[PDB]
Subunit: 91 residues, 4 copies
């Protein structure tokens, strides 16, 4: 499914960008920069916030650039992950 | 039982929440009830007041979120249309 | 619109139940109990958590009982709030 | 401009975010940038690490959430289908 494949690529690239930004601008460990990027775009939310104005502006834009992509990917992923169980419970 | 997709989504949600309860209690040292609370608020995107402390917990939670949100919200949508909406309509009928 | 009216009633009653529960079981001021109930069911999320096991169990169930209702109401409210602006920008 | 609903949702979102920035900076004492950040993460349901301290702020935020989420996510959906999705498709064309 190229639709799923493209959504995966777009999501990974968006999370990489966030990991680079927050690890370099906000001084987070890579794993913490990735964690912050993930909980932000999935809307789970973080227990910290950017300390720099640059980081605050980036996060606002990052949310609007990425929230729709991330939930499109979550939805397509959910279809692929659950379908084997549905098919085994049907055919 | 009538909706097989709903039954699959229910069981997978239950299994997902069990897995999180075991994980956070073992790896992050939470009481089982607090591990379950964390799993639920995380996968509903409510979010908790706490966060994972270990790198293992952080990596797991990222994967848990991406696989978990889709299944929990699939279950929630099915619960709304298959159980809650018919119950409300039934309870609005004059008798 | 009775559909909007029913969703409003259901939402208000659900938030009242939460306000009573968290103000009595978790010892919160009414406004804080309401605030907790709102940010939970809208998935904005709280910076606190229930301290009692009873309150933790209630919150888990409260989320599953109320999240679908609350977003149905948010959606119907959004249609009613934006439609005057759309109609003024059309007719 | 082509989608009039999209234009309405854009302007209302901008006005909503301006209102929150003014409110939280005045009533909760936040810097304007921090007030805007709070408004955005609140209305996208991401959530912040902080919360309103005053009863006025708590009451406003409840009303802001219910009116705001619907408009911001309406704008986000329109932005996805009208701007981002066509841009991605265009950028996938071999040339
Ligand atoms: Cl790291
Ligand atoms: Cl326990
Ligand atoms: Cl009060
Ligand atoms: Cl500022
Ligand atoms: K949240
Ligand atoms: K959320
Ligand atoms: Na949160
Ligand atoms: Na939070
Ligand atoms: Na959400
Ligand atoms: Na927090």
């Amino acid at each position: 499914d190229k639709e799923f494949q493209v959504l995966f690529v777009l999501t990974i690239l968006t999370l990489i960008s966030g990991t680079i930004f927050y690890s370099t601008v906000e001084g987070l460990r890579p794993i913490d920069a990735l964690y912050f990027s993930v909980v932000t775009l999935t809307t789970v939310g973080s227990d910290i916030s950017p300390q720099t104005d640059f980081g605050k502006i980036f996060t606002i834009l990052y949310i609007f650039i990425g929230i729709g992509l991330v939930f499109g990917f979550i939805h397509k992923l959910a279809v692929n992950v659950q379908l084997p169980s549905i098919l085994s419970n049907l055919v």
